[PDB]
């Protein structure tokens, strides 16, 4: 029987009938299902099946032909070419019937077809059909739906195809296209899908489009398309316009006046929402695109260069009409403002600033009177339009008009930023920063910094909605206070600033202010929580009375935070909460310069107890994967990372954490953790090592283990060395192996990808030997154990090592290993000494260099090698 039945039966209460299904499908994947597809194609072709069993059938077939894994999709393509053509092509044959005979939200055959096509179009395994498809659409006798779901399928195909493939049948496709694009076609679904198909195909069109005539003929059909009521086809078209606009930018002069301008003016008048959504995002694209015309012509006339494409200055003739409507348009506000929605408004604003830069002086006469009229409008949705419109033109127009207004405005502004209407002071302050931001009239205040800050202190306690343009106004204020102390010459960043007298209040008002419930208004939270790491950055704790107590307060804020995050069931809520954490991994950074050697350490320990019980609850969910570790690679440096009290908890969860096969990068982190561990495993570490022995054997035995983590394997034993480490130095040779493989690693530094990290590992084994030799110095363990039973290979062990040592000048890290080699190499034995010894140049370059003064210990080591050298002759 048929699988489609099976899809229904994959959810059928019959256990065995489902297991047997989930059984042939996992075998057939391996088996390759030679007929399976044909049978599925016939039933799918049959319109007599419910949409569900068939969409599911498309998901199974899909999952057998394409995949969200690039590779698996390419293998399903190879698996396809492996399948016999009779049955495969036969499947394709029955698959064609399904087009139109079903409804599927996602076309899966399309995505498979395009994916595999990416494999058969290249070899032209089945590119013949396309022309037939062309005839199929240039002559239509198929019902609406038959041709409809088929056009949606072609869209998906153009999408999922290897861009370098549907070229072979592009001509035939263009034939199909021509017959299919006439204005007469009725179904908006098929039409839309055709536009979306264009959208998917826009990548490699270039030759067909390199003819002005065809694109324009298209433009022609598209114009016939611009009056149809269905929104969807229009959207797909404006989108096409945007991409055609970006790549092969072409003139709309023909349609702007005839159709773009009239349509737009009434749409502006059109109170209906049609204008508001479908026509405005694209509109923002065209307006800036036009800005490209007024600046390309107002510089072409300024460059004595005639543009290949010429502007028209519709905007100059339209600036005046435009300035009053958009400014009046700023009144439909939303009291409670969360900044995550996209609407005509944002597009308009970007165009306003972007265009405004492009905009000529006409807008200023059109905005100044508007500013006057609403800068104090009693409303809130109205009062904003004047000030906003003004602040958007502070940089776009040239300075001749802009600089004077700011000049006389500045005296007025100080009083204004203190106007009873709080809004005037809020928008006023943000705007002032917007002025020094867009014009350079003023940089510092002397009789207002303190008074203004007196007003700002009081501003600290209002509603969020009033506070969001205040956090940045404050930022710019910090920008200003830096130019009242800097002068002409200056010492290191000054420890004391006058507010420090009242600063403590600042720091004690922020935690409460920053934690209010009515956060949804005006996107206030983020703008406060960021300036913090900066204000913390922009703060001095040298005295640090507050960093301490305040720090414990910070814990208290943290604790407060870690309770809604102990039960975060929403991804956005959990993600939102990592914002503040991120901000903490920067405020702590802005406090940590001073360890303070007492209270800071104790505070960390208390906090650590806080950090870890949640860690004692962070297991199995991937939580707190790296936010705390970053801090950790800095806490150990505070007291040398002794960790006498800690690591008791560390033993089982990481002991199973070293047992967890899945951790890879996770374990990577524990490695820099272990790096910090080298100064704390001072005692009684011997027994829980048999554990380490299985885990170390498993990871080290497998090659997969990171090449970098070779030195860290042994370099973190020194702390264990203080008490309860008992292995002797039989590991010296393997370190003589690592510095032997980095030479062996034929790392061709042709590209800048391997080097950006590379000279890090050397510092690893370097710290390893340094610690070994320092704590203990020995030439070899039992001479060499391998020579005992690797001797024949030990010849070469000394001949390719002789080639390793062939270089006259070597990197310092390699040289350090070599010096030790010089010693224990003359202590190992005399076999093959004369031939291997007389192996390389710079010997006289080195002897001369050796007799030179101030040579170190290494030069002396070489001479000793001469005792054993005087053991053969």
């Amino acid at each position: 029987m048929e699988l489609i039945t099976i899809l229904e039966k994959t959810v059928s209460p019959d256990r065995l009938e489902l297991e047997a299904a989930q059984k042939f499908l996992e075998r057939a994947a391996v088996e390759n299902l030679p007929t399976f597809l044909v049978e599925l194609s016939r039933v799918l072709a049959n319109p007599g099946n419910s949409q569900v069993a068939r969409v599911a059938a498309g998901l199974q077939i899909k999952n057998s032909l394409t995949s969200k894994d690039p590779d698996i999709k390419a293998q399903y393509q190879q698996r396809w070419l492996a399948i016999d053509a009779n049955a495969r092509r036969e499947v394709k044959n029955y698959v064609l019937q399904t087009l139109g005979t079903e409804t599927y939200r996602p076309s899966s055959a399309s995505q498979c077809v395009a994916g595999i096509a990416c494999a058969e179009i290249p070899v032209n395994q089945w590119p013949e059909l396309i022309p037939q498809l062309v005839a199929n659409v240039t002559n239509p006798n198929s019902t609406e739906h038959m041709k409809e779901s088929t056009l949606e399928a072609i869209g998906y195909i153009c999408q999922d195809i290897d861009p370098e493939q549907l070229q072979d049948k592009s001509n035939e496709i263009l034939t199909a296209i021509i017959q299919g694009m006439r204005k007469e076609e009725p179904s908006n679904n098929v039409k839309l899908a055709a536009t979306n198909a264009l959208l998917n195909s826009l990548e490699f069109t270039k030759a067909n489009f390199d003819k002005e005539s065809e694109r324009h003929f298209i433009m022609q059909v598209v114009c016939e398309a611009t009056q149809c009521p269905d929104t969807r086809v229009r959207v797909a078209a404006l989108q096409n316009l945007v991409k055609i606009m970006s790549l092969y930018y072409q003139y709309m002069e023909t349609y702007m006046g005839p159709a773009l301008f009239a349509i737009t003016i009434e749409a502006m008048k059109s109170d209906i929402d049609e204008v508001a959504l479908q026509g405005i995002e694209f509109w923002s694209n065209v307006c800036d695109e036009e800005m490209d015309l007024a600046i390309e012509a107002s510089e072409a006339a300024e460059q004595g260069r005639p543009p290949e494409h010429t502007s028209k200055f519709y905007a100059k003739g339209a600036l005046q009409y435009l300035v009053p409507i958009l400014t009046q348009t700023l009144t439909k506000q939303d009291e409670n403002d969360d900044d995550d929605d996209w609407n005509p408004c944002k597009a308009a604003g970007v165009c306003l600033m972007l265009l405004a830069t492009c905009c000529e002086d006409d807008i200023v006469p059109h905005v100044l009177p508007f500013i006057k009229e609403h800068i104090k409008n009693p409303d809130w949705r109205y009062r904003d339009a004047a000030v906003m419109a003004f602040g958007c033109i502070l940089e776009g127009p040239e300075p001749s008009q802009l600089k004077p207004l700011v000049i006389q405005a500045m005296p007025t502004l100080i009083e204004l930023m203190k106007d009873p209407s709080v809004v005037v002071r809020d928008t006023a302050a943000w705007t002032v920063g917007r002025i020094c931001e867009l014009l350079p009239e003023a940089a510092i205040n002397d009789v207002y910094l303190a008074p203004l800050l007196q007003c700002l202190i009081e501003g600290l306690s209002a509603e969020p909605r009033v506070a969001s343009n205040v956090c940045w106004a404050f930022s710019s204020l910090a920008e200003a206070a830096y130019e009242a102390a800097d002068v002409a010459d200056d010492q290191e960043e000054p420890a004391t600033y006058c507010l420090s007298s009242s600063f403590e209040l600042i720091v004690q008002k922020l935690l409460e202010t920053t934690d209010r419930p009515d956060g949804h208004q005006n996107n206030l939270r983020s703008s406060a929580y960021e300036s913090l790491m900066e204000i913390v950055k922009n703060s001095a704790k040298d005295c640090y009375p507050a960093v301490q107590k305040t720090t414990l307060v910070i814990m208290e804020r943290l604790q407060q935070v870690l309770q809604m995050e102990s039960h975060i069931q929403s991804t956005s809520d959990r993600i939102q909460f990592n914002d503040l954490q991120s901000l903490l991994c920067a405020t702590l950074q802005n406090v940590l310069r001073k360890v303070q050697h007492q209270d800071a350490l104790q505070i960390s320990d208390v906090v650590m107890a806080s950090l870890l019980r949640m860690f004692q609850s962070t297991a199995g969910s991937g939580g707190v994967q790296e936010d705390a570790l970053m801090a950790v690679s800095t806490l150990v440096e505070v007291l040398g990372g002794e960790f006498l009290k800690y690591m008791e908890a560390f033993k089982p969860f990481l002991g199973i954490g070293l047992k967890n096969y899945a951790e890879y990068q996770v374990c990577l982190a524990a490695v820099g953790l272990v790096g910090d561990l080298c100064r704390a495993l001072q005692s009684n570490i011997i027994p829980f090592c048999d554990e380490v022995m299985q885990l170390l054997l498993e990871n080290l035995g497998n090659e997969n283990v990171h090449r970098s983590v070779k030195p860290q394997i042994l370099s973190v034993f020194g702390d264990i060395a203080l008490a309860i480490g008992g292995e002797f130095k039989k590991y010296l040779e393997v370190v003589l192996n690592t510095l032997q493989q980095a030479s062996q690693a034929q790392v061709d530094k042709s590209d800048y990808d391997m080097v950006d990290y590379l000279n890090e590992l050397r510092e690893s084994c370097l710290e390893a030997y340094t610690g070994i030799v320092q704590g203990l110095k020995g030439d070899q363990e039992n001479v060499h154990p391998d020579v005992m039973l690797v001797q024949p290979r030990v010849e070469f062990i000394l001949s390719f090592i002789d080639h390793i040592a062939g270089d006259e000048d070597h990197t310092d890290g390699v040289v350090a290993c070599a010096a030790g080699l010089i010693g224990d190499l003359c202590t190992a034995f005399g076999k093959d000494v004369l031939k291997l010894v007389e192996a390389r140049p710079m010997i006289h370059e080195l002897l001369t260099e050796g007799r030179r003064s101030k040579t170190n210990k290494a030069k002396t080591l070489a001479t000793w090698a001469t005792k054993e050298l005087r053991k053969l002759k």
């Binding site: 995949s67 969200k68 690039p70 999709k73 970006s246 993600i575 990592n578 991120s582 890879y664």
Partner: protein
Amino acid sequence: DHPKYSDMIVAAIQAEKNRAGSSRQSIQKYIKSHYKVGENADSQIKLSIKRLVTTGVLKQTKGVGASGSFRLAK
């Protein structure tokens, strides 16, 4: 075995390369393009990008935060 996603991200950005256009949306759907990762790809990858911006790996161009268009630093 999971392949390194960030390397893919760099390859995708290079793949979705333009010296004018930089908008993140384009790169993002490019990731939507070709194949697809686990449902939480957007969140985890996006955070990776954000954090490497914080390290100063890349320099802002347009927008603010992961809503924008951005260019490399010098």
